[PDB]
Amino acid sequence: EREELAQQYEAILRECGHGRFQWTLYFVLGLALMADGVEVFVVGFVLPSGMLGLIVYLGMMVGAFLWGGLADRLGRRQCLLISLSVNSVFAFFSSFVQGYGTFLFCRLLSGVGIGGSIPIVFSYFSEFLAQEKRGEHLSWLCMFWMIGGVYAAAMAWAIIPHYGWFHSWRVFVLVCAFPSVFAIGALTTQPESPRFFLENGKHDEAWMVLKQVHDTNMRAKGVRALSLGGQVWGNFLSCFGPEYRRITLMMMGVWFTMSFSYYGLTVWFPDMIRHLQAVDYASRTAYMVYFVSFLGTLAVLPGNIVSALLMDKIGRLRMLAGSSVMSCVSCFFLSFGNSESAMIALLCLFGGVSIASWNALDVLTVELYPSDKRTTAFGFLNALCKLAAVLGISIFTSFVGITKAAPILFASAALALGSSLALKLPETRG
Ligand SMILES: Cc1cnccc1CN1C[C@@H](c2cc(F)c(F)c(F)c2)CC1=O
């Protein structure tokens, strides 16, 4: 059977243990994750300055789907390189645009290019880990997304603290697209994931890559489209086979509900705080939007740190359930606070409580699936997560003049479903 390879692969990985290659690559892929976070922030609160920016999320959905499909048929480095090239190129041309009609098209294309940055990055770094510290390392890697969000927020506040409606978004977009260019430049000098080569049958190339990794670690101590179009459906439609069906549906449900809840709440908080400030002003009778939720992303890092060292001591399923429950209880408790500083503190707490669940999610998604679908399934789940994000943003933007209890209960129900499904997932023996 085409299954008795992971044993020898992990025996080799544990024999080499951990060294400096898994730190160099850690940072190289963290750069791409940082660029993805920068893009997500730019599309979230900076772009709508007319909340039609969800077309960018749709573009990122299509991108994540396509890149997840193509990653295992083109490798985890060629696909990542192409995705980051498309992103950087289009997000750099977005600064020489002439208005909105073409600017939003360029941003949509950049989103399509950068959608396949979380799935490929996480799978690629998962195929270089010893599996006894896999969860902790992946959780640490996740922090670069928050670093990217913080970087984008700081640059946006320092450069463009105003509303679009001589040139501001041009220089701002250059600064925001710098990280993707740096990620490409740093990633040009990495080897394609060895497990991909082993699955392709080119065991010689996989052995060469593994030997190069060992050398790096030892320093211390036309018709082609048809073939590549029907073959990606092999990875996807097989992800609904008898073996991986219940796992995949539960995974889809967890991703959908929890991403929807998080994105809805993160768009809600700045709006509700702004409305409260407006009410305070009436009581007398965007320079702060990049401070709000920027402090949230800064206060999330403690949660990620607490969810990284304990990611393996407790388990990759307990952690998930016990973080989803806490996230749901925090969403319920959000209504308790009715101020500005209190609301900011509650937002920071909720972010720090949900980041642990997110990290457990990303560890479990890459652990469950085999080498063949480790990226196709992850890309599909990320596309569904972005669909849920679009739905959450659209729903939560509507709730302005409606009582906060409605969004509170909506997010609480979504997180309750997420927690139930996560607790209902299979064990870690997969
Ligand atoms: C790393 C990652 C892995 N897989 C899929 C997506 C991602 C990227 N993130 C981060 C998540 C997040 C949730 C929070 F509640 C926070 F407070 C926070 F700061 C960040 C939301 C998301 O989509």
Coordinates of C-alpha atoms and ligand atoms in Angstrom, one line a residue:
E1 CA 0.0 0.0 0.0
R2 CA 1.0 3.6 -0.5
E3 CA 1.0 4.3 3.2
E4 CA 4.2 2.8 4.7
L5 CA 6.3 5.9 4.1
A6 CA 5.4 8.2 7.0
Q7 CA 6.9 5.8 9.5
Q8 CA 10.4 5.9 7.9
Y9 CA 10.0 9.6 7.2
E10 CA 9.3 10.5 10.8
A11 CA 12.0 8.1 12.0
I12 CA 14.5 10.1 9.9
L13 CA 13.0 13.4 11.2
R14 CA 13.3 12.3 14.8
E15 CA 16.9 11.0 14.1
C16 CA 17.8 14.5 12.9
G17 CA 15.6 15.9 15.7
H18 CA 15.4 19.7 15.5
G19 CA 18.0 22.2 14.3
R20 CA 18.3 25.5 12.5
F21 CA 16.6 24.5 9.2
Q22 CA 13.2 24.4 11.0
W23 CA 13.9 28.0 12.3
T24 CA 15.2 29.4 9.0
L25 CA 12.1 28.0 7.2
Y26 CA 10.0 29.0 10.2
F27 CA 10.8 32.6 9.6
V28 CA 10.7 32.4 5.8
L29 CA 7.1 31.1 6.0
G30 CA 6.3 33.5 8.8
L31 CA 7.1 36.3 6.4
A32 CA 4.4 35.0 4.0
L33 CA 1.9 34.6 6.9
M34 CA 2.7 38.2 7.9
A35 CA 2.0 39.3 4.4
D36 CA -1.3 37.5 4.5
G37 CA -2.2 39.1 7.8
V38 CA -1.3 42.5 6.3
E39 CA -3.6 41.9 3.4
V40 CA -6.5 40.7 5.6
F41 CA -6.2 43.8 7.7
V42 CA -6.0 46.1 4.7
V43 CA -9.2 44.5 3.3
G44 CA -10.9 44.6 6.7
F45 CA -10.9 48.1 8.1
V46 CA -8.7 50.2 5.7
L47 CA -10.2 49.4 2.3
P48 CA -13.8 50.6 3.2
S49 CA -13.0 54.3 3.3
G50 CA -19.4 51.6 0.8
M51 CA -18.7 48.2 2.3
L52 CA -18.2 46.5 -1.1
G53 CA -14.7 45.3 -0.2
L54 CA -16.1 41.8 0.3
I55 CA -15.3 41.2 -3.4
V56 CA -11.7 41.1 -2.2
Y57 CA -12.7 38.3 0.2
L58 CA -14.4 36.5 -2.6
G59 CA -11.2 36.8 -4.6
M60 CA -9.2 35.4 -1.7
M61 CA -11.8 32.5 -1.5
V62 CA -11.2 31.6 -5.1
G63 CA -7.5 31.9 -4.6
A64 CA -7.4 29.7 -1.5
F65 CA -9.5 27.1 -3.3
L66 CA -7.3 27.0 -6.4
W67 CA -4.0 27.1 -4.6
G68 CA -5.1 24.4 -2.2
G69 CA -6.1 22.3 -5.1
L70 CA -2.9 22.8 -7.1
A71 CA -0.4 22.7 -4.1
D72 CA -0.1 18.9 -4.0
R73 CA 0.2 18.6 -7.8
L74 CA 2.8 21.3 -8.1
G75 CA 4.4 21.0 -4.7
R76 CA 4.3 23.3 -1.7
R77 CA 7.0 25.7 -2.9
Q78 CA 6.1 26.2 -6.6
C79 CA 2.5 26.9 -5.6
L80 CA 3.5 29.2 -2.7
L81 CA 5.9 31.1 -4.9
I82 CA 3.3 31.6 -7.7
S83 CA 0.7 32.7 -5.2
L84 CA 3.0 35.2 -3.5
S85 CA 4.2 36.4 -6.9
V86 CA 0.7 37.1 -8.1
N87 CA -0.1 38.8 -4.7
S88 CA 3.0 41.1 -4.7
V89 CA 2.7 42.0 -8.3
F90 CA -1.0 43.0 -8.1
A91 CA -0.8 44.6 -4.7
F92 CA 2.2 46.7 -6.1
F93 CA 0.3 47.7 -9.2
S94 CA -2.6 48.7 -7.0
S95 CA -0.5 51.8 -6.1
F96 CA -0.4 53.1 -9.7
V97 CA -4.2 52.6 -10.2
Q98 CA -6.3 55.6 -11.3
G99 CA -9.4 55.3 -9.1
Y100 CA -11.7 52.7 -7.6
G101 CA -12.9 50.7 -10.7
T102 CA -9.4 49.4 -11.4
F103 CA -8.1 49.7 -7.9
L104 CA -10.6 47.2 -6.6
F105 CA -9.9 44.9 -9.5
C106 CA -6.2 45.0 -8.6
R107 CA -6.9 44.3 -5.0
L108 CA -9.2 41.4 -5.9
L109 CA -6.4 39.9 -8.0
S110 CA -4.0 40.4 -5.1
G111 CA -6.5 38.7 -2.8
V112 CA -6.8 35.8 -5.3
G113 CA -3.0 35.5 -5.3
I114 CA -2.6 35.7 -1.5
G115 CA -5.5 33.4 -0.6
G116 CA -3.3 30.4 -0.9
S117 CA -0.9 31.6 1.8
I118 CA -2.2 30.1 5.1
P119 CA -2.9 26.5 3.7
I120 CA 0.4 26.1 1.8
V121 CA 2.4 27.7 4.6
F122 CA 0.9 25.6 7.4
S123 CA 1.2 22.3 5.4
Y124 CA 4.7 23.1 4.2
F125 CA 5.9 23.8 7.8
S126 CA 4.0 20.7 9.0
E127 CA 6.0 18.5 6.6
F128 CA 9.2 19.5 8.4
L129 CA 8.2 18.7 12.0
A130 CA 8.8 15.7 14.3
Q131 CA 5.1 15.3 15.3
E132 CA 5.9 15.3 19.0
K133 CA 6.4 19.1 19.0
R134 CA 4.3 19.6 15.8
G135 CA 1.4 21.5 17.5
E136 CA 3.7 23.8 19.4
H137 CA 5.8 24.8 16.4
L138 CA 2.7 25.3 14.2
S139 CA 1.1 27.4 17.0
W140 CA 4.3 29.5 17.2
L141 CA 4.2 30.0 13.4
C142 CA 0.6 31.2 13.6
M143 CA 1.8 34.3 15.5
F144 CA 3.2 35.8 12.3
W145 CA -0.4 36.4 11.1
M146 CA -0.9 38.6 14.2
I147 CA 2.5 40.3 13.5
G148 CA 1.3 41.1 10.0
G149 CA -2.0 42.5 11.3
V150 CA -0.1 44.7 13.8
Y151 CA 2.4 45.9 11.1
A152 CA -0.4 46.8 8.7
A153 CA -2.3 48.6 11.5
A154 CA 0.8 50.6 12.6
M155 CA 1.7 51.6 9.1
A156 CA -1.9 52.6 8.2
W157 CA -2.2 54.7 11.4
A158 CA 1.2 56.4 10.7
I159 CA 0.7 57.0 7.0
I160 CA -3.0 57.3 6.1
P161 CA -5.0 58.2 9.2
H162 CA -8.0 59.5 7.1
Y163 CA -10.7 58.4 4.7
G164 CA -10.2 58.0 0.9
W165 CA -13.7 59.5 0.3
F166 CA -2.0 64.3 -3.3
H167 CA -1.6 60.5 -3.0
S168 CA -1.9 58.4 0.2
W169 CA -3.1 54.9 -0.7
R170 CA -0.3 54.6 -3.2
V171 CA 2.5 54.8 -0.6
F172 CA 0.4 53.0 2.0
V173 CA 0.0 50.1 -0.4
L174 CA 3.7 50.0 -1.2
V175 CA 4.4 49.7 2.5
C176 CA 1.8 47.0 2.9
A177 CA 3.0 45.0 -0.1
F178 CA 6.7 45.2 1.0
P179 CA 6.3 42.1 3.3
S180 CA 5.1 39.9 0.4
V181 CA 8.1 40.9 -1.7
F182 CA 10.4 40.1 1.2
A183 CA 8.7 36.8 1.7
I184 CA 9.2 35.9 -2.0
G185 CA 12.9 36.9 -1.8
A186 CA 13.5 34.9 1.3
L187 CA 11.5 31.8 0.0
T188 CA 13.4 31.6 -3.4
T189 CA 16.1 29.6 -1.5
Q190 CA 14.1 26.8 0.1
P191 CA 13.5 23.2 -1.0
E192 CA 10.2 21.7 -2.0
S193 CA 8.6 19.7 0.7
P194 CA 10.2 16.2 0.8
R195 CA 6.9 14.4 1.5
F196 CA 5.5 15.9 -1.8
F197 CA 8.5 14.4 -3.6
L198 CA 7.9 11.0 -1.9
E199 CA 4.2 11.1 -2.9
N200 CA 5.3 11.9 -6.5
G201 CA 7.5 8.8 -6.5
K202 CA 10.7 10.7 -6.9
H203 CA 12.3 9.2 -3.8
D204 CA 15.7 10.3 -5.0
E205 CA 14.8 13.9 -4.9
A206 CA 13.2 13.5 -1.5
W207 CA 16.3 11.8 -0.1
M208 CA 18.4 14.6 -1.6
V209 CA 16.2 17.3 0.1
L210 CA 16.4 15.4 3.4
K211 CA 20.2 15.1 3.2
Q212 CA 20.4 18.8 2.5
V213 CA 18.2 19.5 5.5
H214 CA 20.5 17.2 7.6
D215 CA 23.5 19.1 6.4
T216 CA 21.9 22.4 7.3
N217 CA 20.9 21.1 10.8
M218 CA 24.3 19.6 11.5
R219 CA 25.9 23.1 11.7
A220 CA 25.0 23.1 15.4
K221 CA 25.7 20.3 18.0
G222 CA -2.2 23.2 -23.7
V223 CA -3.5 19.7 -22.8
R224 CA -1.6 19.9 -19.5
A225 CA -4.5 21.9 -18.1
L226 CA -6.9 19.0 -18.5
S227 CA -4.5 16.6 -16.6
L228 CA -4.0 19.2 -13.9
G229 CA -7.7 20.0 -13.7
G230 CA -9.2 16.6 -13.3
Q231 CA -6.4 15.5 -11.0
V232 CA -7.1 18.2 -8.5
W233 CA -10.7 16.8 -8.3
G234 CA -9.0 13.6 -7.3
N235 CA -7.7 15.2 -4.1
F236 CA -10.9 17.0 -3.4
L237 CA -13.6 14.4 -4.2
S238 CA -11.5 11.8 -2.4
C239 CA -11.7 14.1 0.7
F240 CA -15.4 13.0 0.8
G241 CA -14.6 9.3 0.6
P242 CA -15.6 6.8 3.3
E243 CA -12.4 7.3 5.3
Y244 CA -12.3 11.1 5.4
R245 CA -16.0 12.1 5.3
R246 CA -17.2 12.7 8.9
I247 CA -13.8 14.3 9.7
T248 CA -14.2 16.6 6.8
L249 CA -17.8 17.7 7.5
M250 CA -17.1 18.3 11.2
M251 CA -14.0 20.2 10.2
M252 CA -16.0 22.3 7.7
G253 CA -18.6 23.1 10.4
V254 CA -16.1 24.1 13.0
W255 CA -14.2 26.3 10.5
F256 CA -17.4 28.0 9.2
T257 CA -19.0 28.8 12.6
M258 CA -15.8 29.9 14.4
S259 CA -14.5 32.0 11.5
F260 CA -17.9 33.6 11.1
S261 CA -18.1 34.4 14.8
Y262 CA -14.6 35.8 15.0
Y263 CA -14.8 38.0 11.9
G264 CA -18.3 39.2 12.8
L265 CA -17.2 40.3 16.3
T266 CA -14.0 41.9 15.0
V267 CA -15.9 44.0 12.6
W268 CA -18.6 44.7 15.2
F269 CA -16.2 46.0 18.0
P270 CA -14.9 49.1 16.1
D271 CA -18.4 50.0 15.0
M272 CA -19.9 49.7 18.4
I273 CA -17.1 51.6 20.1
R274 CA -17.5 54.3 17.4
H275 CA -21.2 54.5 18.0
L276 CA -20.6 54.7 21.8
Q277 CA -18.2 57.6 21.2
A278 CA -20.8 59.3 19.1
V279 CA -23.4 58.8 21.8
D280 CA -21.0 60.3 24.4
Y281 CA -20.5 63.3 22.1
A282 CA -24.3 63.7 21.9
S283 CA -24.3 63.6 25.7
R284 CA -22.7 67.0 25.8
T285 CA -25.3 68.8 23.6
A286 CA -10.5 56.9 11.3
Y287 CA -7.4 57.9 13.3
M288 CA -8.6 55.5 16.1
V289 CA -10.0 52.6 14.0
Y290 CA -6.3 51.5 13.5
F291 CA -5.8 51.8 17.3
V292 CA -8.9 49.8 18.1
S293 CA -8.4 46.1 17.2
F294 CA -4.7 47.0 16.8
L295 CA -4.6 46.8 20.6
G296 CA -6.7 43.7 20.1
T297 CA -4.1 42.0 17.9
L298 CA -1.4 43.2 20.4
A299 CA -3.3 41.7 23.3
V300 CA -3.9 38.4 21.4
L301 CA -0.2 37.5 21.4
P302 CA -0.3 36.5 25.1
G303 CA -3.1 34.2 24.3
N304 CA -1.1 32.6 21.5
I305 CA 1.9 32.2 23.7
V306 CA -0.2 30.5 26.4
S307 CA -1.7 28.3 23.7
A308 CA 1.7 27.4 22.2
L309 CA 3.6 25.9 25.1
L310 CA 0.5 24.0 26.3
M311 CA -0.5 23.0 22.7
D312 CA 1.1 19.5 23.3
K313 CA 1.0 19.1 27.1
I314 CA -2.8 19.0 27.2
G315 CA -3.6 17.8 23.7
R316 CA -4.8 19.1 20.4
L317 CA -8.4 18.4 21.0
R318 CA -8.9 19.3 24.7
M319 CA -7.2 22.6 24.1
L320 CA -9.7 23.2 21.2
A321 CA -12.8 22.3 23.2
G322 CA -11.7 24.2 26.3
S323 CA -10.9 27.2 24.2
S324 CA -14.1 27.1 22.2
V325 CA -16.2 27.0 25.4
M326 CA -14.3 29.9 26.8
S327 CA -14.7 31.9 23.6
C328 CA -18.5 31.2 23.7
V329 CA -18.7 32.3 27.3
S330 CA -16.7 35.5 26.5
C331 CA -19.1 36.2 23.6
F332 CA -22.0 35.9 26.0
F333 CA -20.2 38.2 28.6
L334 CA -19.5 40.8 26.0
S335 CA -22.9 42.3 26.6
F336 CA -22.0 42.9 30.3
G337 CA -19.7 45.8 29.4
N338 CA -21.3 49.0 28.2
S339 CA -18.4 51.5 27.9
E340 CA -15.4 52.2 25.7
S341 CA -12.4 51.1 27.7
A342 CA -14.4 48.2 29.1
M343 CA -15.4 47.2 25.6
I344 CA -11.8 47.4 24.4
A345 CA -10.7 45.2 27.3
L346 CA -13.4 42.7 26.6
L347 CA -12.4 42.6 22.9
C348 CA -8.8 41.9 23.8
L349 CA -9.9 39.1 26.2
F350 CA -12.1 37.5 23.6
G351 CA -9.3 37.6 21.0
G352 CA -6.8 36.1 23.5
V353 CA -9.3 33.4 24.3
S354 CA -10.2 32.5 20.7
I355 CA -6.6 32.5 19.4
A356 CA -6.0 29.2 21.3
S357 CA -8.9 27.6 19.6
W358 CA -7.7 28.8 16.3
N359 CA -4.2 27.4 16.8
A360 CA -5.7 24.0 17.9
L361 CA -7.8 24.2 14.7
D362 CA -4.9 24.7 12.4
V363 CA -2.9 22.0 14.2
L364 CA -5.7 19.4 14.0
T365 CA -6.6 20.2 10.3
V366 CA -3.0 19.5 9.2
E367 CA -2.7 16.5 11.5
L368 CA -5.8 14.7 10.4
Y369 CA -5.4 14.7 6.7
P370 CA -2.8 12.5 4.9
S371 CA 0.1 13.7 2.7
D372 CA -2.1 13.7 -0.4
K373 CA -4.9 15.9 0.9
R374 CA -2.9 17.8 3.6
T375 CA -3.2 20.9 1.4
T376 CA -6.3 20.4 -0.8
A377 CA -8.5 19.8 2.2
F378 CA -6.8 22.7 4.1
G379 CA -7.4 25.0 1.1
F380 CA -11.0 24.0 0.8
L381 CA -11.5 24.6 4.5
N382 CA -9.8 28.0 4.3
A383 CA -12.1 28.9 1.4
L384 CA -15.1 27.9 3.5
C385 CA -13.7 29.9 6.4
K386 CA -13.4 33.0 4.2
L387 CA -17.0 32.5 3.0
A388 CA -18.1 32.4 6.6
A389 CA -16.0 35.5 7.2
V390 CA -17.8 37.3 4.4
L391 CA -21.2 36.2 5.8
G392 CA -20.2 37.4 9.3
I393 CA -18.9 40.8 8.1
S394 CA -22.0 41.4 6.0
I395 CA -24.4 40.4 8.9
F396 CA -22.5 42.3 11.6
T397 CA -22.2 45.5 9.5
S398 CA -26.0 45.7 9.4
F399 CA -26.3 45.7 13.2
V400 CA -25.8 49.4 13.9
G401 CA -29.1 50.7 15.1
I402 CA -30.1 47.2 16.4
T403 CA -29.6 46.2 20.0
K404 CA -26.3 44.6 20.7
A405 CA -28.0 41.6 22.2
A406 CA -28.7 40.4 18.6
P407 CA -25.1 40.2 17.5
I408 CA -24.1 38.8 20.9
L409 CA -26.6 36.0 20.7
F410 CA -25.7 35.3 17.0
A411 CA -22.0 35.0 17.8
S412 CA -22.7 32.9 20.9
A413 CA -24.8 30.5 18.9
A414 CA -22.2 30.2 16.2
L415 CA -19.4 29.6 18.8
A416 CA -21.7 27.0 20.5
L417 CA -22.1 25.1 17.3
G418 CA -18.3 25.3 16.7
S419 CA -17.5 24.0 20.2
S420 CA -20.0 21.2 19.9
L421 CA -18.6 20.0 16.6
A422 CA -15.0 20.4 17.7
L423 CA -15.7 18.3 20.8
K424 CA -17.5 15.7 18.6
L425 CA -14.4 15.3 16.4
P426 CA -12.4 12.0 16.4
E427 CA -9.3 11.4 18.5
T428 CA -5.7 12.2 17.7
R429 CA -4.8 8.7 16.7
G430 CA -5.2 9.5 13.0
Ligands
LIG1 C1 -3.5 31.8 11.6 C2 -4.6 31.2 10.8 C3 -4.7 29.9 10.6 N1 -5.7 29.3 9.9 C4 -6.6 30.0 9.4 C5 -6.7 31.4 9.5 C6 -5.6 32.0 10.3 C7 -5.7 33.5 10.4 N2 -6.6 34.0 11.4 C8 -6.2 34.4 12.8 C9 -7.6 34.3 13.6 C10 -7.7 35.2 14.8 C11 -8.7 35.0 15.6 C12 -8.8 35.8 16.8 F1 -9.9 35.6 17.6 C13 -7.9 36.7 17.1 F2 -8.1 37.5 18.2 C14 -6.9 36.9 16.2 F3 -5.9 37.9 16.5 C15 -6.7 36.2 15.1 C16 -8.6 34.6 12.5 C17 -8.0 34.1 11.2 O1 -8.5 33.8 10.2

